[PDB]
């Protein structure tokens, strides 16, 4: 219930930045493409292009950059264990 003041945080994809200011441009995934601004708890550097970032649902603002899309049918071929075979 202290996680109830947390946020839904919809994730997106960034096309490019603009000059003299952040003024970031985002394709969400299906909805539309919006021009946004960053929130205050971000770093103005690691918001580069082609970067899956979590964006506010109400005010449309970028919060956290994340690892990209990994195509989860490719996630299941890392071994995650060690089969016991000795030299």
């Amino acid at each position: 219930q202290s996680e109830q003041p947390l946020q839904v945080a919809r994730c997106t994809k960034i096309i490019n930045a603009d000059s003299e200011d952040p003024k970031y441009i985002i394709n969400v995934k299906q909805f539309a493409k919006f021009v946004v601004d960053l929130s205050d708890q971000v770093a103005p550097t690691d918001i580069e292009e082609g970067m899956r970032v979590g964006v506010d649902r109400n005010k449309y603002q970028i919060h956290i950059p994340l690892p990209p899309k990994i195509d989860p049918t490719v996630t299941m071929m890392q071994v995650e264990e060690k089969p016991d075979v000795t030299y």
Binding site: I14, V35, E49, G50
Partner: peptide
Amino acid sequence: VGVNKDSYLILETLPTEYDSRVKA
């Protein structure tokens, strides 16, 4: 162009329609 959501009024002029893969 940059358009307001509610008013549907043209505000700015955006540079290009370029894919992120092309930028990559």
